[PDB]
C-alpha cells in the first residue's frame with residue numbers, strides 16, 4: 001500500500017556520468033561504450049549563446065580542447081562530431097560500467113527519471129513527464145546541462161532526454177540522445193515561449209485507478225460517460241483528448257479494479273466540474289498527471 | 305529553477321541489497337562489510353506473526369537456515385544474532401561495494417530516500433519524511449521488508465530506516481539499523497494505530513522559501529507574527545509547534561531571500577486561515593512538508 005512518485009534506481013546511470021569542459025564552460029556528459037555525449041552548447045561562451053553558429057564555433061575546437069573527466073581521472077578524446085544538438089566525443093576507453101542501453105525518443109505524456117548532475121557528479125534523482133508542450137518541469141541549476149532522463153526495463157537503460165536549457169519561464173527543454181530537441185526549442189539564448197501545458201488525461205486516470213487500489217475511493221461516483229462527452233469537458237479544462245488507444249492502455253487497471261474506464265472518466269469529469277472540496281487523493285489536492293498507466297501497474301505490482 | 309521532490313542517487317545503496325530467505329519467507333537484506341542486516345520477522349511464518357516469541361523461534365534456526373543471495377550468487381552465513389528487531393547475519397565475504405557508512409537514528413520531520421526492493425532487487429527510489437507520529441508514508445508491497453532509508457553526505461551513506469511493517473491503515477513502520485522501531489510499534493500482526501499525523505511546520509516554511517526562490521511569490525503578505533501567536537494558529541491546524549531552534553535552522557533561507565522567518569510564518573498563518581483559493585505553490589495545491597531546510601538549501605545550491 002501507498003503510492004509514491006518513484007524514480008528508477010539510478011546506479012546504472014551514475015556509472016555513466018562524466019564532466020565535460022570546453023574552455024571555461026563545464027557541464028555533464030554521458031559516457032556509453034567509447035563515446036561521451038553532451039550538449040553542443042559546451043563550446044559556447046555566454047556571449048556566443050546569444051546567436052551561436054555551432055559549425056563555425058566547432059572549427060576552432062580540436063579533440064584536446066574537450067576535457068573529459070570520469071571521477072578524478074581524465075579520459076583521452078580521440079574524435080569528436082556534432083549530431084544535431086549533441087556532441088559525441090570518442091574516447092580511447094570504453095566505459096567499464098556501460099549498462100545495456102537504448103536511445104529512445106519519447107512521446108508527450110511519457111514519464112522518466114532524471115539524474116540531476118553538476119561537474120559530472122550526481123546530486124539527485126526525480127521523476128517527471130514530457131509535457132504535452134514538449135517542456136519538462138525539472139529542477140536544474142546552471143551546470144546541470146547534460147544531466148539525463150531515462151527509463152529502465154529490468155537491466156536495459158533507455159535514455160530519452162538530455163537537459164539543455166531553461167526557458168525564461170523556468171520550465172526546461174532538452175533533446176533525445178540523437179540531439180533532436182523535444183518540441184520547437186533551439187539551443188540559443190533567445191526568448192522562446194512554451195505552448196499550453198495541458199493535463200495528461202490518461203495519466204490522471206491511471207493515478208485515479210492507483211488511488212482506488214490504495215483505498216482512496218471517495219471520488220467514485222454513480223455516473224458513466226462516453227469518450228465524446230468526456231472530451232468536451234476535457235477540452236474546457238485544458239486536458240488532453242482521450243482516445244480509444246488510451247482506453248486500451250488502461251484496460252489492465254480497469255480489470256484489476258472492476259471499474260470500467262468510462263466510469264472512471266465520469267468520476268474525473270465530476271472532479272473537474274466540482275473540484276476537490278478541500279479533500280485529497282493519494283495525499284494530493286490536485287489531479288496528478290505524471291504517472292503513466294504502465295507506472296501504476298509497475299508500482300502496484302512491484303516490478304524490479 | 306524548478307523544485308522537485310528529489311531523492312539521493314541510489315547507486316551506493318543498490319550495491320548493498322541482497323535477498324534473505326528463511327524457510328518460506330523471503331525479504332530484503334542490507335549487506336555492509338561482512339554483515340547482512342534484515343528484519344527479524346524473516347524467521348516467521350504468517351501464523352507466527354500473530355504472536356511471535358522471536359527468541360524461541362530463533363532457537364529452531366541455524367546459520368544454514370538463512371539463505372543470502374547477492375545478485376545470482378549465494379553468500380555463506382557463518383554467524384547470526386538478533387539485535388532488537390533486526391537480525392545480523394555474519395557472512396564469510398565482505399561486500400566489495402560497501403560504501404562509507406554510518407547508522408543514524410533520525411528525529412521526526414527528517415527526510416530520507418528509500419530504495420524499495422523485492423527479492424533483493426531495487427525497483428524504485430523515492431523521498432519521504434519520518435512523520436511526527438513515527439510512521440512513514442511509503443510505497444511498499446509484500447516482500448518490500450528490509451528495504452532501507454538513507455541520506456548521503458558526499459560519499460558517506462547514513463542509513464536511518466529499514467522497512468518492517470504496514471499498519472492496518474496503510475501507513476508504514478520500521479526501525480533504525482540497530483533494530484529499534486521508530487515510535488511505539490512492534491513487529492507483530494496485531495492492530496496498532498498511529499497517532500495524529502501533524503504537519504512538519506519547519507519543513508513547510510522551508511518549502512515556502514523554496515517557492516520564493518523559484519518565483520512563486522503570490523502568497524507573500526504584508527504581515528508579520530510572533531512565535532507564540534503563530535503557534536496558537538499552528539495548534540489549531542494540527543501543525544507542529546515552531547521553536548527558536550527551527551527559526552535558527554531557517555536562517556540561511558531567510559538571509560538568501562531577505563524574508564524574515566516570522567514574516568514567512570505570517571504568510572503561512574494566512575494560508576492556513578484563508579486556504580489556497582484554487583491556487584498552487586510549486587505545482588502543489590497543499591502545503592508540502594517533506595522538504596527540510598537542509599534539503600531546500602542543498603537542492604537550491606546543487607550539492608553533489
Ligand SMILES: N#Cc1cncc(CC(=O)Nc2cccnc2)c1
Nearest residue numbers: 041140141142164165166187188189
Ligand atoms: N541549449 C541551450 C541553452 C541556451 N541558452 C542558454 C543556456 C543556459 C541555460 O539554459 N542554463 C540552465 C540553467 C538552469 C537550468 N537549466 C539550464 C542553454
Ligand SMILES: N#Cc1cncc(CC(=O)Nc2cccnc2)c1
Nearest residue numbers: 345444445446468469470491492493
Ligand atoms: N514487523 C512486522 C510485521 C508484522 N506483521 C506483519 C508484517 C507483514 C507486513 O507488514 N507486510 C507488508 C506489506 C506491505 C508493506 N509493508 C509490509 C510485518
